Structure 1
Amino acid sequence: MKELIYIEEPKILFAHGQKCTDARDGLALFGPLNNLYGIKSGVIGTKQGLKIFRDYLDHIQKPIYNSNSITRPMFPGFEAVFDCKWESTGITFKEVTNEDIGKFLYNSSTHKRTYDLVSLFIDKIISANKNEDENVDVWFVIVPDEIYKYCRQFHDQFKARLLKHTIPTQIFRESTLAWRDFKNAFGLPIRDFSKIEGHLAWTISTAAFYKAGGKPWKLSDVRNGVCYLGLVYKKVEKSKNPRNACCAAQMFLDNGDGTVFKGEVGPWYNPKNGQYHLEPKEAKALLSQSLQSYKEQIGEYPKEVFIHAKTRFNHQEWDAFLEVTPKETNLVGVTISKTKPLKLYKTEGDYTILRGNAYVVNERSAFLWTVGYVPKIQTALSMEVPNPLFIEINKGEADIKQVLKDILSLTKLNYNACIFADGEPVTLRFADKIGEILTASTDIKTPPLAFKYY
């Protein structure tokens, strides 16, 4: 007989001061926070890729309906939602011949063909950005179903090699936008989106609007003076050793006005294999970088810093953290895990445990159900029984209830997708994506450090 506490669902702030809980409903009811005028689409690829992009873009002008609009809200249309003109008349097309892909695909090696394909694509994009007068806001790279299949590394290297030019790029697969046509040898769509077409339109439109300089939404309930972080460790494989720990971080204050969320980036390296920990000098450098980023933007150092991680800290890096941390700044190192196999079953039958139930084990440890039944959409976010996140304050002092509330608040800022909520604080997810991109090509000085470029 144990007890479960409950924490209220956070609200995200939309246009003209309107809050809500679902991103899709809030967008369809009030629209994005900011106002763009239009999106100038640059397209790079084959002629049939241009045709697919054009017909999909003209497809998402008109409203799209789901099989059950309660679980998946309908998409009213791009100009209806985002009040921006993302129309087929703004396309600037660069032609990549199928024969070039023929030479660069049918070789024997895998690294060399990936490098050749990336060289071709980024070279066309770089030339079009450098020595042309047409302006492109987002470059869409429509690849056939022979690159993402036979060369999957291509995406990571492609995004890593464009970082020196700050080109917002959106990769697409021909089957993604031509799922109706892209049937199998049996004549059946392997990617049947008939009942969830509006969901795909929501995701694509929100990603494109975000990469084009727009801010669709932001969380409304987060206190000032607290800066959140997320550190993730990746293995680099192209080096001499099998793996060397590479730490990359994402960063999030609140703002002067609203939702500063950039990512304290610039990878740090520990050569010892398996030691997912920071040496004192690297921890000092990272903490100083984040603190200076806060200081230059607001003018005073934050009073609370909530460092997240998927690993446990050791004492050396923690004391280094305190060494560089000022005396007036609180430091709370939290750890978030998933491998603990706890499961709560509903005794009443079909539907699963409601999302938001917290099993506060003690002052410094609790379980949180960030994924589960949501009463508003009337559906569980998983298929099997969801597994909670084991959130335990590893170092420092802070309320466990407040920590759980902040973790449930930071699971809504997934601009890469249009869903109700994520199953992990988005800071860690975006730090993971940044590290994955950065550890693909080992030549980037002062990485761009903005999420639209990743």
Structure 2
Amino acid sequence: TFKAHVFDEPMLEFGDGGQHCDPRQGLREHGPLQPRSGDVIRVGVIGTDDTVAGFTEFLAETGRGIESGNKQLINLNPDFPGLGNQNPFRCKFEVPDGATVTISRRQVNDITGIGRHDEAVRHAVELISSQLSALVEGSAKPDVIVLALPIPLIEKLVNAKSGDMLNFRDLLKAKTLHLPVPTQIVWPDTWDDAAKIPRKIKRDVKATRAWNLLNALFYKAGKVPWRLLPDQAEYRTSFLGIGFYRDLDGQQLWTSTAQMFDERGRGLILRGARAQTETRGRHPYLTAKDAEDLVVQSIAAYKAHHRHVPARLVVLKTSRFRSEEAEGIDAALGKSGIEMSDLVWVQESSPIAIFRDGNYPVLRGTFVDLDGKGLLYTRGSVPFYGTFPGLRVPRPLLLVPHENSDSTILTLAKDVLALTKVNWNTTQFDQKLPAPIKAAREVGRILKHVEFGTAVSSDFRRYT
């Protein structure tokens, strides 16, 4: 019993039908899925005079090509071939004139000079949110805006490590959610993502960082470097994540969200009804009626932004499907007319794990059937990378399909594994959670500063 399969590194389709597993190595040979001639990305910049010039220099060096940090692990730390004849994105990253707004020395000193942290974060967001709106409404017409705050301002706005207090990035994303241009907040020295995670007090990968900033810029601009290679070309499959986030204000109630993704990696975020709770405000769940409306509101939202109706729709959750929840979802699916429907409970914190002989962990893609339950290892030893990227041992995912599901747990485990390659943060493809689950955590951090009943955009690019 407990038969184990080791899945293939799921395939990605790139330009002109080219296929590969690495996002970078795939873009290195075929380019993006759909290339258009003369494509250009209008990149706006906000920061000090020093940071803006630093971004212009990094963009120039990035265009000239950047050598690998460690040659021994070239697949994990590749060269950037630079903008030109070997450019993988096959698109121009430009900062046109007049698309730059600069925070003065006065303004930076005014933010740092505020003692109260909540009062200082509200003041800085108030400043930059009126600088982002001023750049969107301008004639510069940027596609993605890069926020390059100076280090002393970042250290005031981002706590460190070795909801009682406001988080800067989350509040900013909420205030600029009605704005159509996405924003990329970067460190001015390394140019990696900033304010997503707590910084390090003793903070002290160039090519890999450049790959990632450019990837983020491309996805934010609205283009797609690759789609998930489907099992059948005619078969259309969408993946809907359902989560909940608790408001810190009022009656401290729970609100249901939906994270709707397609085979190309484009998310559609929606807010559902207030959730119910089993005990003392914890254990959030949805009623049968609210569950049907959210899924109907999600299918209608997907069908608006696409051409084909998906033959199959997978619904993912991090908590068990309540029978009231499952009944409403299956009711909306039966009314939607979708051919196949699968409901999956993705457990993040299952203590079950398998251990092999030796120091290196089990291969990524290892799947062990547990009599209807599936222990999937999204993170682990990667043959392409020649090592295990992480240090702490991986903790696998227990996948529990609902009885109403139509696919086997073998096909569903492949989908979850492939869904971990949709990655708006890095170009590394060994992510722990599938895209709907990662999107659930981000939108919960942001929409909790947006009042319930207020209209929210369904564009995931604004949320990243």
- Give the TM-score taking structure 1 as reference length: 0.88
Query: Residue type matched to 1:174 in 2?
Result: P
* Separation in 1, partners of 2:400, 2:427: 29
Q: Which residue of 2 aligns with 1:140?
A: 146
Q: Which residue of 1 aligns with 2:185?
A: 171
Q: Which residue of 2 aligns with 1:441?
A: 450
* Separation in 2, partners of 1:382, 1:30: 29
Q: 1:403 to 1:215 in 2, by over 3 A?
A: same
* Separation in 1, partners of 2:305, 2:41: 29
Q: Which residue of 1 aligns with 2:70?
A: 67
CA contact (8 A) 2:319 2:345 kept: yes
CA contact (8 A) 1:40 1:90 kept: no
The yes-or-no answer on 1:415 pairing with 2:424 is: yes
Query: Residue type matched to 2:314 in 1?
Result: F
The yes-or-no answer on 1:333 pairing with 2:329 is: no
Q: Which residue of 2 aligns with 1:217?
A: 226
Q: 1:301 to 1:67 in 2, by over 3 A?
A: closer
1:9-408 alignment runs, 5 A limit: 9-33=9-33, 34-35=35-36, 37-64=39-66, 65-68=68-71, 69-79=74-84, 80-87=87-94, 92-130=99-137, 132-152=138-158, 153-177=167-191, 190-191=202-203, 196-223=205-232, 224-237=235-248, 239-241=249-251, 243-254=252-263, 259=264, 261-270=266-275, 272=277, 273-296=281-304, 302-326=310-334, 328-329=337-338, 330-347=340-357, 349-362=358-371, 364-397=372-405, 398-408=407-417
Aligned residue for 2:244, secondary structure, equals strand
* Separation in 2, partners of 1:277, 1:102: 46
Aligned residue for 1:209, secondary structure, equals helix
Q: 1:144 to 1:268 in 2, by over 3 A?
A: farther
Give 1:400 deviation, angstroms: 0.8
Give 1:407 deviation, angstroms: 0.8
Query: Residue type matched to 2:374 in 1?
Result: A
Q: Which shifted more, 329-338 or 205-214?
A: 329-338
RMSD of equivalent CA atoms: 2.6
Which runs of no fewer than 5 residues in structure 1 stay unpaired? 180-188
Query: Residue type matched to 2:266 in 1?
Result: F
Residue by residue over 1:423-444, the C-alpha shift from the partner in whole angstroms, topping out at 9 and shown as x without a partner, is 1111211232223222223278
- Give the TM-score taking structure 2 as reference length: 0.86
Q: Which residue of 2 aligns with 1:183?
A: none
CA contact (8 A) 2:276 2:285 kept: no
Residue by residue over 1:115-163, the C-alpha shift from the partner in whole angstroms, topping out at 9 and shown as x without a partner, is 1111111112212332x32221211111122444333411111111112
CA contact (8 A) 1:266 1:446 kept: no
Q: 1:282 to 1:148 in 2, by over 3 A?
A: farther
Aligned residue for 1:427, secondary structure, equals helix
Q: 1:5 to 1:271 in 2, by over 3 A?
A: closer
Q: 1:236 to 1:78 in 2, by over 3 A?
A: farther
CA contact (8 A) 1:345 1:385 kept: no
CA contact (8 A) 2:191 2:213 kept: no
* Separation in 1, partners of 2:228, 2:462: 22
Residue by residue over 1:322-350, the C-alpha shift from the partner in whole angstroms, topping out at 9 and shown as x without a partner, is 33332654443211112222333332x33
Identity %: 25
* Separation in 2, partners of 1:293, 1:128: 29
* Separation in 2, partners of 1:441, 1:133: 29
* Separation in 1, partners of 2:25, 2:334: 42
Q: 1:271 to 1:6 in 2, by over 3 A?
A: closer
CA contact (8 A) 2:237 2:311 kept: yes
Residue by residue over 1:278-306, the C-alpha shift from the partner in whole angstroms, topping out at 9 and shown as x without a partner, is 12332121011123235556688655332
Which runs of no fewer than 5 residues in structure 2 stay unpaired? 159-166, 194-200
The yes-or-no answer on 1:429 pairing with 2:443 is: no
Q: 1:310 to 1:57 in 2, by over 3 A?
A: same
Q: Which shifted more, 40-49 or 107-116?
A: 107-116
CA contact (8 A) 1:291 1:301 kept: no
